Design a protein around this nucleic acid. Structure first.
Lengths: 696, 772, 158, 51, 50
RNA sequence: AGUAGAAACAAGGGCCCUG
């Protein structure tokens, strides 16, 4: 491909290809005609067939491939020698046993039109033979030799099949004498437009074409315009060392409250043993209900904080009743209708039915979008981060598959390292939250798919396994089903992705709330529970979800992949620089900065620092939004500048103030962004003790 | 059957409509393809999401209905649903079902008799598995790796083909009834098709899947990847489990897939024939083309033509390049200057003249290029990136791993750029004899200096000294090269840079059609030389296995075996169409006229004269027995006929038929003098040489129309002749006409008369008759 | 090719009721199962099926006038009682090249009282000890075995 | 090693086997010799030895 | 499981090609080459699948 | 009420259906 010549070389001899190429070069015509000519030429060749006359001499003589002047010279030479009349036009081959030229034609159309035109043009002067790719023949004399016909028709059949396979079996590549001028059918309107879209100095496409086809280079005027534009610009250049980075200005106002749907630190759970037979949610929610603790609860009408407590209380009573009925279903009353927004959607009013009096009656102005409002730095984030680093008294919170066999050292190494990391990570608290989200979201998605237009009841639960003590005592530790609270959906008619289906969260806790943090919740004093006895609280709120958040939360095992990648990378890099197995040592020894305490830095081995990265990834998965996206996208410049500072690379920039502005623009009411921004400021501060390019 | 009648009724109902009629009447059949797109068009953004959102339903799958009824697939087996009577909106002939149905079929559904055919369908992947099982793993180590990027092949494949040669192969094996006209690749590769057909014939199968798998079985997956160590497809298919940037899982994988042996054999043959043609002085071109087309070689089981393999391989060697140029085969933009490799990255230029004095005053013209250019270069275990500027080596960088290779590459690069004073004033050691013209063929000073370097190491040392030497500045100690090729020294060469880590080989998916001269020097639309005959080893002797040099000059046999072979060839050439030939006589059962052929009369003198009568008796006997009935083997008559010329007599036939040169053939068992196999029934092996029998008639073994296609040909269409099938095609008479259907939407007229010649000679000759 | 097409070809317009011989060597039969044979063939007295990928004899119809059969080069094993059910007037048999392990597979052939010659070559049974003698004691009516009678009497041409 | 007898799975465990075309067998026929073609097998095995 | 074959060579399942003995070529390197000349070995082409 | 973003949802079609 890539050229008509290579194509023709597929079924033709390269010799005839070169011949027809030189010919078109002589006449300087479009090279799309390389094919037809070569075909004609090859036919002429295979028509000679090296036949001979009575005198042991060649019978046919070829003239087509020769130049035009030389061809005419030979034509006249033969017309003279054998005493023949000169023809007005040129021919392709001449025979001696009959002493009359012969012309060959070819066409695709199954009709005599080409042969009629040729016979009119030449009458009966010489012998004419026109073949068809589809097995036809028209002539003005006796038929040729059999072998010739066979040899020609077979070649033509192969060629036609090939062309039809290449979509080139059309008039374009195989035209007749007349249809040899292909051109875009330039109409009237298109030209009217083309002469109107021309740049200013020109007014007709002809002028532009004449100016471009003849354009010559004048470097001097180009350089002059370059310098001129280079003077009226004054592009600023700012080496960071001289122009340092100020700190980031966080917004001001109230504190950013809890946003995650479920509680992590303040969550209390009831546990039981798991039986393989009863494993579904609608079953466990009853098993926990029989023992009486779930029913022992009985909140009061006086809430510590929140709003609409009556609706919440009635909803809890209805939940208990439905559980007693063994049917996880709820009826449509005024309360649920309110706390479900069942009738909240606006009623449409067509404009065809609209008038000025209607507008003046009830103002129908354009909606005034109320963008989010700012917030302040949250002081409870570090507490959650430090709580999500410690063990949880159990493990196996996140389900995982099995390990396959192994045959080589590579798979052994991989399995060993993966086992270490998984055993270390499965014991934390963030892990139980991940498993909780996984299972609850799976159940909710199933329900939304099966029982829409119906209010259901879904638990907030998880499955785990008590840790393994020594062989002493009861061996083979058992499993456990844990329950943190209750969840409820509301008519998840997910007509379209990105939609919203309101839900409700009833959770159990033993820790009083804070107005700043637990602002959205509506807590009640329930009663007492054992461990001795301790009071009990009931955190209650409202929120919503969608298909996308469900699908992604269910796929919350990626943090493991990222953390494993980072750790294995570090260990392999440290092991290669020394050409020795340095993995366990790198995990138990290499220290990583974590935080500050008493104005000093703190460190611990990587084996325990993995948890920080894991929680970071989990939070990225939880609080993900456009704000965090833009922030994490705009912070890379600062880190690259920092690296340049570490290596004495004299970095520079064009307008850092604009970068800081862009960054601070996307910091609103999203705790993660605020926390990480404050931590980045603290980073640059701590590094200023060891590096430049930062202001205090 | 009744199904056929139903199809006819449906066609009638559909033609009764107007739009369907208009579309099935207008245009050609190709429109079908177009119509295949306007229907069933629907995509999705995140199929994962919709898959979890659908599989959460009751009946997310569709399926056929009658297949379930016939299979007796119930509903609500054990209170679990499997399907329910409904009609999907698109198909209208399918019914919703659940995934559980897929298990119910797998556990208590209809069972087929056998399923080992799968191993053939997916042969490539079972081959992967087997190659994996035959490996002996080794220890694991950690270190840094020099992974170079380059274009390579990842799928080991035998008999690599093109795409046009496959679209046809996928038909003659599977959907033969609608097969197009026979292409040359088929007539040549008959046994291959027969093999591929023996397995996928008379089997219950989905054919589209088979075609896709065959495409994969004949596709070498070419990729641009980082690579380390040896380069072989057997490794690249699992490179992921051998080593990365920081680790290496040692393992030995040398004795598998026997690939590179074929390539080195091919290159050796190419070198041989190139030297042979160089022995000529005025026609090395035609000599080489003849040597090519007069040669063949075996691949696994089959025998392939050389010119066919050469146009399929991608070995960028100064030998393969020449051949592919003679045959008009396009190729890539890769250079070659002796053993090294080169590739241009950027720049331009044009030839220029200059001279040098060899000894005292002896002017000799040598050329160079007048511009700046940049080149990548690759020698054994060594890479380089350099630039030339007006007869000077501007700069160069190296990333190899050896000192010797690093010096040889540097020297050949310096030569390629004509850098140094030697090209300005050659040394005394060289003389006019070493200059050029072993027997008249000149030699540019470039290759002269090349061989002058390859002769002695001290010439190389002096050449390197010709390059500027200076003191190793501070800091550059690491990026410096001494005279021995050391990564650092106190004094190093001029304008040189070293580094650890090979250079990333460039890439370009371009093709060029080049040519060559009468001196075997290729040109590419410019005065640049890409290959020659001075860049290859001088000479060497090798004993090629499973090869056929059916050419006089390329032959070692004596006049006796050669006469026998040529007699057999002539006797086979009478296997064509037309009366007076053996097929017509067999059809007429004229077993007698064979004895009177002229060819047996020419081979008779070769028969042992003291027992020619007895053998004759036996031969004639066999012939009659085979001819009278019709159950004959064409590969035995062609063997025994030469003995039927004389008169029968009486005597004891031991079992062998001797010629006059103490070489015999036995009627029924293959020997060195005459061998054949039922696998490849289109070849005859005599004294190792191979002979291609035409395909005009088919005996008991041959079991399709494929064996008759060389007896048929196209002719002027005649509506009077009858229309028949591809199976009754054998019951026609030699010289008759018949109409027929070909492929799809095409009818033609054929005649059982062959055409002996091919276009190679009828065009070239007539051309040479024009340059006068 | 295929036994179906081979047969339809051999039957050059001839009815399948007046033939005395048939040959199907170098063919193929799906599942190693006969295909195209019926009881229509009555006058048939000879048959030859060699190298056709055969493995059993179950679809073979009833042929009385048949007195010679050839099944070499195939892999038949076990089915040798039909011969009594379909061809009880058989005299010449050949099985060289087939899968034959023990003699219990051969025992049914005793009922072919019309049997004269048998041909077993390249089979596993031949690799036993005292097999010719034990076979003769099993099939007394038989006289020729692989072309040789008791005392190694070479059999004539025909 | 060469053989004309297909193997059995039990006795032949250390052996890897193939099928290499065909061969010929020769036996007497009256006062002449004849040849009867048969298949051919190839028995592959590895083993050690000592002085 | 049953005890398998142990000896190096084959006793009962063996097979052998034959040729005339020449006292001038009575050595392994020569006998093997002679056996190979007639091309009965080259005909030995084992298929891929065992 | 609520969600989230830099706009959308808070069922939609004909008393009945549906994602």
């Amino acid at each position: 491909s890539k050229t008509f010549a290579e194509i023709a070389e597929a079924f033709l001899e390269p010799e005839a290809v070169r011949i027809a190429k030189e010919a078109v070069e002589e006449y300087g015509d479009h090279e799309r005609k390389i094919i037809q000519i070569g075909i004609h030429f090859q036919v002429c060749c295979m028509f000679c067939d090296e036949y001979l006359s009575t005198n042991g001499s060649d019978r046919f003589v070829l003239i087509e491939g020769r130049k035009r002047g030389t061809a005419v010279s030979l034509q006249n030479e033969l017309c003279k020698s054998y005493d023949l009349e000169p023809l007005p036009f040129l021919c392709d081959i001449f025979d001696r046993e009959e002493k009359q030229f012969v012309e060959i034609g070819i066409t695709r159309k199954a009709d005599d039109s080409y042969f009629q035109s040729k016979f009119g043009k030449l009458g009966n002067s010489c012998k004419i033979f026109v073949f068809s790719y589809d097995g036809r023949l028209d002539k003005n004399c006796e038929g040729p030799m059999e072998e010739q016909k066979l040899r020609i028709f077979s070649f033509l059949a192969t060629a036609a099949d090939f062309l039809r396979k290449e979509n080139m079996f059309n008039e374009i590549f195989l035209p007749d004498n007349e249809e040899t001028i292909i051109e875009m059918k330039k109409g009237k309107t298109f030209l009217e437009l083309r002469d109107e879209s021309v740049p200013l100095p020109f007014q007709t496409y002809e002028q532009m074409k004449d100016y471009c086809e003849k354009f010559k280079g004048n470097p001097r005027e180009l350089a002059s315009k370059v310098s001129q534009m280079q003077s009226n610009i004054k592009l600023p250049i700012k080496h960071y060392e001289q122009n340092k980075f100020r700190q980031i200005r966080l917004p001001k106002g109230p504190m950013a409250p809890y946003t995650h749907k479920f509680l992590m630190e303040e969550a209390w759970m009831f546990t039981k043993i798991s039986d393989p037979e009863r494993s579904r949610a609608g079953e466990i929610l009853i098993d926990f209900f029989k023992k009486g603790n779930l029913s022992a609860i009985r909140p009061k009408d006086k809430p510590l904080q929140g709003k609409y407590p009556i609706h919440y209380k009635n909803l809890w009573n209805q939940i208990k009743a439905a559980i007693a009925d063994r049917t996880m279903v709820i009826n449509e009353n005024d309360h649920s209708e309110f706390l479900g927004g069942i009738g909240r959607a606006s009623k449409k009013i067509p404009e065809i039915s609209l008038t000025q009096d209607v507008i003046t009656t009830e103002g129908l102005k354009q909606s005034e979008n109320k963008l989010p409002e700012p917030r302040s730095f949250p002081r409870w984030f570090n507490a959650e981060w430090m709580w999500a680093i410690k063990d949880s008294d159990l493990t196996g919170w996140v389900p995982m598959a099995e390990y396959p066999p192994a045959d080589n050292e590579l798979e052994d190494y991989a399995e060993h390292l993966n086992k270490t990391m998984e055993g270390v990570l499965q014991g934390t608290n963030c892990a139980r939250e991940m498993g909780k989200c996984i299972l609850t979201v799976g159940a909710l998605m199933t329900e939304c798919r099966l029982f829409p237009g119906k209010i259901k009841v879904v638990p907030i639960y998880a499955r785990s396994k008590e840790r393994k003590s020594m062989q002493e005592g009861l061996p083979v530790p058992s499993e456990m089903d844990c329950l943190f609270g209750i969840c409820v959906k509301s008519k998840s008619h997910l007509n379209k992705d990105d939609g919203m289906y309101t839900i409700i969260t009833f959770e159990f806790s033993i820790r009083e709330p804070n107005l700043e943090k637990h602002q959205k919740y509506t807590v009640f004093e329930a009663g007492h529970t054992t461990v001795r006895e301790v009071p009990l609280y009931l955190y209650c709120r409202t929120t919503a979800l969608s298909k996308i958040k469900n699908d992604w939360l269910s796929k919350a095992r990626r943090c493991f992949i990222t953390t494993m990648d980072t750790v294995e990378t570090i260990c392999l890099r440290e092991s290669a620089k020394a050409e020795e197995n340095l993995v366990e040592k790198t995990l138990n020894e290499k220290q990583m900065w974590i935080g500050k305490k008493n104005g000093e830095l703190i460190a611990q081995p990587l084996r325990e620092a993995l948890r920080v990265q894991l929680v970071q990834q989990f939070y990225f998965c939880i609080y993900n939004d456009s704000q965090l996206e833009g922030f994490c996208n705009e912070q890379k410049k600062i880190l690259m500048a920092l690296e340049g500072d570490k290596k004495n690379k004299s970095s520079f920039g064009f307008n850092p103030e604009g970068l800081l502005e862009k960054i601070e623009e996307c910091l609103i009411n999203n705790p993660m962004c605020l926390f990480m921004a404050q931590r980045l400021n603290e980073l640059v501060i701590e590094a200023s003790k060891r590096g430049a390019k930062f202001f205090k | 059957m009744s199904l056929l009648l139903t199809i006819a009724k449906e066609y009638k109902r559909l033609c009764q409509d107007a739009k369907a009629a208009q579309m099935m009447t207008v245009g050609t059949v190709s429109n079908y393809t177009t119509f295949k797109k306007w229907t069933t068009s629907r995509k999705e953004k995140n199929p994962s999401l919709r898959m979890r959102w659908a599989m959460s339903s009751k009946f997310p799958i569709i399926a056929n209905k009658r297949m379930l009824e016939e299979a007796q697939i119930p509903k609500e087996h054990n209170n679990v649903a499997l399907w329910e009577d409904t009609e999907d909106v698109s198909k209208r002939d399918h019914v919703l079902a659940s995934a559980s149905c897929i298990n119910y079929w797998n556990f208590c559904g209809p069972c087929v008799n056998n399923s080992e055919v799968i191993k053939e369908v997916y042969k490539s992947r079972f081959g992967r598995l087997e190659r994996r099982k035959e490996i002996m793993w080794k220890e694991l180590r950690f270190t840094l790796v020099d992974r170079q990027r380059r274009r390579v092949d990842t799928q080991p494949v035998e008999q690599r083909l093109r795409t046009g040669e496959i679209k046809d192969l996928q038909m003659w094996t599977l959907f033969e009834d609608e097969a197009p006209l026979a292409s040359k690749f088929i007539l040549d590769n008959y046994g291959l098709v027969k093999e591929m057909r023996s397995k996928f014939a008379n089997k219950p199968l989905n054919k589209e899947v088979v075609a896709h798998m065959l495409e994969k079985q004949f596709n070498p997956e070419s990729r641009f990847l980082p690579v380390f160590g040896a380069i072989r497809p057997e490794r690249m298919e699992l490179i992921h489990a051998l080593g990365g940037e920081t680790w290496i899982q040692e393992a030995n994988t040398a004795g598998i897939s026997n690939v590179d042996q074929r390539k080195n054999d091919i290159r050796a043959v190419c070198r041989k024939v190139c030297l042979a043609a160089n022995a000529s002085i005025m026609n090395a071109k035609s000599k080489l083309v003849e040597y090519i087309k007069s040669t063949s070689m075996r691949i696994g089981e089959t025998e392939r033509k050389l010119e066919e393999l050469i146009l399929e391989t991608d070995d960028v060697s100064p030998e393969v390049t020449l051949c592919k140029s003679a045959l008009g085969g396009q190729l890539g933009k890769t250079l070659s200057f002796g053993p090294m490799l080169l590739k241009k990255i950027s720049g331009s230029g044009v030839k220029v003249k200059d001279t040098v004095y060899i000894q005292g005053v002896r002017a000799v013209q040598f050329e160079y290029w007048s511009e700046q250019e940049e080149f990548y270069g690759e020698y054994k275990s060594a890479t380089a990136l350099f630039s030339r500027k007006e007869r000077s080596l501007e700069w160069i960088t190296i990333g190899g791993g050896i000192n010797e290779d690093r010096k040889r590459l540097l020297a050949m690069c310096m030569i390629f750029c004509r850098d140094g004073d030697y090209f300005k004033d050659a040394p005394a050691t060289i003389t006019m004899a070493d200059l050029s013209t072993k027997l008249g063929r000149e030699i540019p000073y470039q290759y002269v200096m090349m061989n002058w370097i390859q002769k002695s190491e001290d010439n190389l040392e002096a050449l390197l000294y010709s390059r500027g030497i200076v003191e190793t500045n501070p800091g550059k100690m690491g990026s410096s090269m001494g005279i021995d090729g050391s990564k650092r020294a106190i004094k190093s060469l001029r304008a040189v840079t070293i580094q650890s880590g090979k250079i990333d080989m460039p890439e370009s998916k371009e093709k060029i059609h080049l040519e060559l001269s009468d001196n075997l020097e290729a040109f590419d639309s410019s005065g640049r030389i890409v290959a020659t005959i001075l860049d290859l080893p001088s000479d060497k002797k090798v004993t090629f296995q499973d090869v056929s040099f059916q050419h006089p000059d390329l032959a070692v046999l004596r006049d006796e075996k050669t006469a026998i072979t040529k007699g057999y060839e002539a006797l086979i050439k009478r296997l064509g169409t037309g009366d007076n030939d053996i097929p017509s006589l067999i059809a007429k059962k004229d077993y007698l006229s064979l004895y009177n052929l002229p060819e047996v009369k020419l081979m008779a003198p070769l028969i042992r004269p003291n027992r020619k009568g007895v053998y004759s008796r036996v031969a004639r006997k066999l012939v009659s027995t085979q001819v009278t009935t019709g159950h004959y083997s064409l590969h035995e008559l062609i063997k025994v006929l030469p003995f039927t010329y004389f008169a029968p007599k009486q005597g004891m036939f031991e079992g062998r038929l001797f010629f006059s040169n103490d070489s015999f053939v036995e009627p029924g068992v293959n020997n060195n003098v005459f061998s054949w196999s039922k696998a490849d029934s289109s070849k005859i092996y005599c004294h190792g040489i191979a002979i291609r029998v035409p395909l005009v008639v088919g005996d008991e073994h041959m079991d399709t129309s494929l064996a008759l296609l060389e007896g048929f040909s196209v002719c002027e269409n005649d509506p009077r002749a009858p229309m028949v099938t591809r199976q009754d095609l054998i019951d026609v008479g030699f010289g008759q006409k018949v109409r027929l259907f070909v492929g799809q939407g095409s009818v033609r007229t054929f005649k059982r008369t062959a055409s002996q010649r091919a276009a190679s000679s009828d065009v070239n000759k007539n051309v040479k008759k024009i340059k006068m | 090719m295929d036994m179906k097409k081979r047969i339809h070809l051999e039957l050059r317009n001839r009815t399948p009721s007046d033939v005395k011989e048939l040959v199907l060597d170098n063919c193929r039969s799906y599942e190693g199962k006969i295909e195209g044979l019926t009881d229509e063939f009555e006058e048939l007295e000879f048959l030859s099926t060699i190298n056709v990928g055969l493995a059993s004899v179950a679809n073979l119809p009833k042929l009385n006038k048949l007195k010679k059969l050839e099944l070499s080069d195939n892999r038949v094993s076990g089915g040798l009682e039909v011969l009594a059910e379909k061809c009880p007037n058989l005299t010449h048999l050949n099985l060289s090249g087939n899968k034959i392990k023990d003699l219990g597979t051969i025992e049914p052939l005793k009922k072919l009282e019309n049997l004269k010659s048998l041909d077993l070559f390249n089979c596993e049974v031949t690799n036993l000890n005292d097999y010719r003698e034990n076979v003769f004691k099993l099939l007394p009516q038989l006289t020729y075995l692989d072309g040789y009678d008791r005392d190694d009497k070479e059999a004539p041409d025909s | 090693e060469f053989s004309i007898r297909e193997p059995n799975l039990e006795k032949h465990q250390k052996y890897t086997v193939f099928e290499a075309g065909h061969t010929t067998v020769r036996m007497k026929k009256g006062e002449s010799v004849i040849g009867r073609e048969v298949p051919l097998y190839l028995y592959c095995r590895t083993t050690a030895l000592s002085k």
